Amino acid sequence: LNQLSNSINAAVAFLLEARNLEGWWQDFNFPQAASIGDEWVTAYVGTMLATLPYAHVHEALMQAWELLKIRDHRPTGEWGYNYILCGDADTTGWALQLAAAVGASDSERAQQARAALATHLQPNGGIATFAEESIRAYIKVPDLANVSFQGWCGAHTCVSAAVAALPEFRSRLHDYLRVTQTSQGNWEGYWWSDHEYTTALTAEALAAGGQAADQPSIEQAVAWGLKRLCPQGFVATSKHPNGSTFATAWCLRLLLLNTVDAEVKAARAAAIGWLLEQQRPNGSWVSSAYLRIPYPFDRNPNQFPHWRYYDEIEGDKRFEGSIIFDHNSIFTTATVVNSLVKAAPML
Helix, strand or coil, X not given: CHHHHHHHHHHHHHHHHCCCCCCCCCEEEECCCCEEECHHHHHHHHHHHCCCCCHHHHHHHHHHHHHHHHCCCCCCCCCCCCXXXXXXXXXXXXXXXXXXXXXXXXXXXXXXHHHHHHHCECCCCCEECCCHHHHHHHCCCCCHHHCCCCCCCCECHHHHHHHCCCHHHHXXXXXXXXXXXXXXXXXXXXXXXXXXXXHHHHHHHHHHHCCHHHHHHHHHHHHHHHHHECCCCCECCCCCCCCEHHHHHHHHHHHCCCCCCHHHHHHHHHHHHHXXXXXXXXXXXXXXXXXXXXXXXXXCHHHCCCCEEHHHCCCCCCCCCEEECCCCCHHHHHHHHHHHHHHHHHC
8 A cells, every 4th residue: 555655646746747827737749730738637637636535636626617617618618638739628627527526516607518518419329529620610621511520510429428418418318328338338439549548537527327127237347347457467458469558547547347257356456466567667658548539421431441640640731540658647547547536445
C-alpha cells in the first residue's frame, strides 16, 4: 500500500503541475488544423481526478469547471475538443460528469448542456458525437457536397458508454448498449483503438443501473477482461506487445465489477504491480491513449485495415485513416491513477 500511495501521489503532482498558467489540462494535437485539445481533456482529467479525497485536487476541479463555464461561445451550450471545434456529445458528457463532482449539475449551463446532449440521441437509442449541420460548418475538406457524414453523425458506442455514466441518460441508452455487446462479451468503440475503454465504461453503466437482468452481460464483460490481461499484468496490443498502460488501466476498472472471484482478484493485483513498475520518474505513464480519426462516411472503423500513426507518416499526410495520441501523457496518466485509486481497496 505504501508503494501505491507514493505512485498515486507522484501522478497527482505531475497532473497538477502539468496544467498551463490559466489552469487547463491540454493534450492531443492536430498540427496546423484543430491544434491542441483543452475543453475535452480538462473535462476528462477533472472527472478522472474526482476519485481523489484531497482538498487541493477538488480545488483544481472547481477551477476546471470555472474554465469550462468561460467557454460559453457556442449557442447550444455544448463543449468541444477545443475553442475552435464545434460542440460534440462526448466532450459535453465528460463536462457534465465534472459538473457532478463540483455540485453544479443543476447550474444553468449544466441544464443547457444537458438539453443539447439529449438532442444527439438517435432513432436506434444510441448517442451521436456530431450533429451534421454543426460539423459540416466547422471542417474544411475537399468535395464536401459529395461526402457522406453517416460515420461521424451516426450513433457511437464509445460515446454512448461514456454518456451512460450520467444517471439521467442511463435509461435512454440501456437497450442500445445491450444489443451492441459482442458474442465474446466486449463492446467495440468508434473513435478509440482500444476496446477496453468502451467495454469498461459500458459494464460500469450497467452495474451502476443495478438491474438483475443485466448481471449476465456484466459477467461476460469481466470474463473478456480477464482473458485480455496477460499473467504478467498487462493488456497486450499490436502497437504495445509488452503492454499498453491506457488499455491496462481501463481493463483494471472493468475487473473491479467482480469482487468475489479469486482469479479476478489475482489479475487486478498483477495489473497494479505492473502499472507501478511502468511509472516514469516524474510520475507520469507513457502515452498510449490512441484516438483514431475515421473517414466521415466510415460506419465501421473496426473494419478499416489501413490505420497508421500520424507522427510516423513521412511526406504529405491527412488525418483521415490515421491515429493520434496524447503527446503530453496527461490523458494516459489521469486514466492510470484513477484506476489505481479505485483498485487499491480491493487488494
